[PDB]
Design a protein around this ligand. Structure first.
Ligand SMILES: [Mg+2]
Ligand SMILES: [Mg+2]
Lengths: 362, 352
């Protein structure tokens, strides 16, 4: 574990991702992803070990320890220098894909603030990821373009004038651009409306998946599925428009259940807080259920004195990889449920004692 | 059937019972019952045919065709002069009990407006019943005492100084009084509260039963314990509990209207859709649907339909009345076809 690997696996929620983005009650994050390949180098499907090593080596040489103004310094993490639990944490923080952990010459060039993650030797040689809190696809696209320009200064992209950027996936040819949004939709699930919505979203060339990428914790990721022939601007508007609708529909449904079944909803969310604050065993499944309830309670003003950032942190912190990393070494499922309960209840008791004791001074 | 029998079985809802009584959205009727026996005559349990027969002859001789000022003329109906479906209609109109239909010398002295029904030779020699629309136990008690005095002018009641009126059932001894209200409680049923309410009412010396003895969300609440209680205590025990149920059912009604407005409009209008368009319908579904539509009228969701029309259908679609109205016995399947047609026509009639 290098000092920079420790830096990226240490915190479940980066300071970058703790910032308040627009519509952050419904949209947790926005992701922009640009795929490219080296000109004259065979796509990862048919390239040699030597080729893959050169891609990583060229990045360590020209981009490691280098900087972009306004984004910060970039550090290169090689998958081969990371223990299995270290790699899982990077997955659970949404910094790398699961498939990157299986790539023998996989690596990722990460900005120190964790806003930019350039995956190397995944499905394409280069996958630039920009991750913003809340709803900011245009802002994420700008950062993506800065990193893209930065890399193209020293890398010649597989490009042709009639097809655009050449990618391994034939559908991906063109912009290499994929946009996804992470959304918390507890009211649309609760009111039994989401299963009549998802089929409509899939009609618009988008795809809906759970947090992993079933929808535990009522968290849904909506991303571009069809991009062949679309411009960058069309790709981002196709997702933006659907997300903005979902923001409105999820808000209306929250206001609806709050107005019609106020006490039942308070009972639901405080009972879930009750579980999190007193349980001695809890699985990931139930944790996700309860965290969703409490987050809905916070958003509606029912659950008081608890910030949403604590909940975002626990959603990552209670994942099985991160929980084992944080506890030091692998753990049986039963042991995890005991450690998870202790971590959640202690983190929660801590947040209500700060809120008790700093509020008391005033 | 005699001209007086035909009169009492012709209409499902008497003009008397169409009057708007107090709290009539929740309380359909109030009933007062005074039981008495002839002095020197054995209780129906051990009385002889000659004895039983004398009791009804005396009522024919002194009360048949006689009148009470402010109530109207009375007429005697003998159970042995009535066909079984005719007897069934009277049970379904709540004028007599089922046990009276099996009593060979049973009879009932009925006021022509159907406000008073004096059963003869049932569980006691005399059972004075007064039935009022809505929630008016006290007015029913006044009318009951008026009928009681009238009979006592010519009948010596079996009475003792330590015990009160002597009745066959030893726990009715004393006043011979039993009070009842028939209540429509759909919201407390929908909101799954009635089962936590009924056990509590049963604790207060009351009993809760179905429509004739809980289809259609209709509950009959009666005095269960009367021994040692005064008349005043018997009537107030039921009145206060009933008055609480009125408020609790009204609060639950307003509550669900506010919590699930369109779902409630959907439920009651779909039940109206069934009633106005079905070609087959059983007693069970009819009562289910009439309850929904009645709730809709009460909350203002369903307009242009009077609750009196619904009360009439609730009786009119009963299996006995349906067969009487159709002129003869009916297979259950045939009843379901004629019931649907009957409901459909009354409803189409009222919406023009
Ligand atoms: Mg570019
Ligand atoms: Mg008297």
């Amino acid at each position: 574990a290098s000092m920079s690997l420790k830096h990226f696996i240490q915190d479940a929620l980066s300071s970058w991702m703790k910032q308040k983005g627009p519509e952050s009650d419904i949209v947790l994050s926005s992701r922009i992803r640009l795929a490219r390949n080296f000109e004259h180098i065979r796509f990862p499907t048919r390239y040699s070990n030597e080729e893959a090593s050169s891609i990583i080596q060229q990045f360590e040489d020209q981009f490691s320890e280098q900087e972009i103004p306004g984004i910060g310094k970039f550090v290169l993490i090689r998958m081969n220098d990371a223990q299995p639990l270290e790699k899982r944490v990077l997955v659970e923080k949404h910094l790398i894909s699961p498939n990157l952990t299986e790539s023998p010459f996989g690596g990722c060039l990460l900005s120190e603030n964790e806003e930019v993650s350039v995956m190397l030797n995944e499905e394409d040689h280069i996958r630039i990821q920009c991750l913003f809190p809340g709803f900011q696809l245009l802002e994420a696209m700008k950062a993506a373009n800065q990193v893209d320009d930065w890399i193209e200064e020293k890398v010649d992209y597989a490009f042709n004038e009639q097809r655009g950027y050449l990618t391994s996936c034939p559908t991906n040819v063109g912009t290499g651009l994929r946009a996804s949004v992470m959304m918390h939709l507890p009211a649309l699930v609760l009111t039994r409306q989401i299963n009549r919505i998802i089929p409509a979203i899939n009609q618009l060339g988008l795809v809906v998946r759970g947090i992993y990428g079933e929808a535990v914790g009522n968290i849904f990721q909506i991303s571009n599925q069809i991009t062949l022939g679309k411009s960058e601007q069309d790709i981002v508007e196709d997702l933006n428009s659907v997300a903005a609708q979902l923001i409105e529909q999820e808000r209306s449904a929250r206001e609806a259940i709050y107005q019609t079944s106020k006490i039942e909803l308070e009972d639901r969310v405080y009972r879930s807080y009750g579980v999190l604050s007193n349980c001695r065993m809890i699985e990931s499944k139930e944790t996700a259920k309860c965290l969703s309830d409490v987050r809905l309670g916070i958003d509606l003003g029912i659950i008081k004195g608890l910030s949403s950032n604590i909940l975002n942190e626990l959603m990552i912190l209670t994942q099985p990889g991160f929980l084992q990393q944080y506890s030091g070494g692998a753990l049986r499922p039963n042991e995890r449920d005991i450690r998870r309960a202790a971590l959640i209840r202690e983190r929660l008791h801590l947040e209500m004692n700060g809120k008790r004791q700093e509020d008391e001074s005033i």
